[PDB]
Curated annotation (Swiss-Prot):
It is an enzyme of class 3 (hydrolase). It comes from Klebsiella pneumoniae. Initially two different KPC beta-lactamases were identified from two different Klebsiella (KPC-1 and KPC-2); they were later shown to be identical. It comes from the Bacteria. The keyword Signal applies. GO terms for molecular function: beta-lactamase activity. Keywords: Antibiotic resistance, Hydrolase, Plasmid, Signal. Belongs to the class-A beta-lactamase family. InterPro entries: Beta-lactam/transpept-like, Beta-lactam_cat, Beta-lactam_class-A. The active site is at residues 48, 146. Not inhibited by EDTA, inhibited by clavulanic acid and tazobactam. Inhibited by cyclic boronates, including vaborbactam and bicyclic analogs of taniborbactam. The gene is KPC-2. This is Carbapenem-hydrolyzing beta-lactamase KPC-2.
């Protein structure tokens, strides 16, 4: 589908010129097979958007570990990382593995993320899971909050919008997860609360959307990926990532939404 990529090439370049940074977009229409690419193979910092794959990784481990999702996890005050709005409310009680996973996806809870990263063997364990579903691009290298440095040219804690999309499609529509675990992942993504102004702001009001956002902040680095379900039609999977050369460059949610629109425009 080289035709549709060329259709939106000039609009995408004008958008990233207005933003003053780089924009990486990949989108595939599972109803036709048409794809749109713009910097889709370049590396962008994952930021918080890794927590979606972190939850899918926990779901795959629950398959051969029955009752993993129900295992209570108690944690002290030192386990609290800045921006842990869900975990700091159960500090005196604890939470379940499934609760921590839903908090990491839907609220980007950081203490919950590090607690789950520890459950999987650290960032290498999550990287191991993505390789095991066919993703050779994804890599996680550090924990919260070190993974958010978004240093120009640093491949640590990065993936490509295409690999993100391809892996998201495998885990939400393909066979990387079993039918029970697949629906829970889609359900966790559908209930995300942090993405109202990104991909969700780019789709019609009747579309069902599951997404996970990321906001390094520095270097104008923010992102969003989603599986969107048009009414009575096959779903589209897409990923939109941005970065910028200067540490104090500001990210733009509006730019992310506008990029999600141009990709849907490219696919129809
Ligand atoms: O990515 C993020 N958030 C999100 N976006 N979409 N969903 N969640 C996100 C949040 C934060 C953060 C900010 C303040 C306090 C605690 C954490 N940092 C962060 C962490 C360290 C250095 C620079 C940025 N990055």
């Amino acid at each position: 589908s080289h035709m549709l990529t060329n259709l939106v090439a000039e609009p995408f370049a004008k958008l990233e010129q207005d933003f003053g940074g780089s924009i990486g977009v990949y989108a595939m229409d599972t109803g036709s097979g048409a794809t749109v690419s713009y910097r889709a193979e370049e590396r962008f910092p994952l930021c918080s958007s890794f927590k979606g794959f972190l939850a899918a990784a926990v779901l795959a481990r629950s398959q051969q570990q029955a009752g993993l999702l129900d295992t209570p996890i108690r944690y002290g005050k030192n386990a609290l990382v800045p921006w842990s709005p869900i975990s700091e409310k159960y500090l005196t009680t604890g939470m379940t593995v499934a609760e921590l996973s839903a908090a990491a996806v839907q609220y980007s809870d950081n203490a919950a993320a590090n607690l789950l990263l520890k459950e999987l063997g650290g960032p290498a364990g999550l990287t191991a899971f993505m390789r095991s579903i066919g993703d050779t691009t994804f890599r996680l290298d550090r924990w919260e909050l070190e993974l958010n440095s978004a240093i120009p040219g640093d491949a640590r804690d990065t993936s490509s919008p295409r690999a993100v999309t391809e892996s998201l499609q495998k885990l939400t529509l393909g066979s990387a997860l079993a039918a029970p675990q697949r629906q829970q992942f889609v359900d966790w993504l559908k209930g995300n609360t942090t993405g109202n102004h990104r991909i969700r702001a780019a789709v019609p009001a009747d579309w069902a959307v599951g997404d996970k956002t990321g906001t390094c902040g520095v270097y104008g680095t923010a992102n969003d990926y989603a599986v969107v379900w048009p009414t009575g039609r096959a779903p589209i999977v897409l990923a939109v990532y941005t970065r910028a050369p200067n540490k104090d460059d500001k990210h733009s949610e509006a730019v992310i939404a506008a990029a999600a629109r141009l990709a849907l425009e490219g696919l129809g």
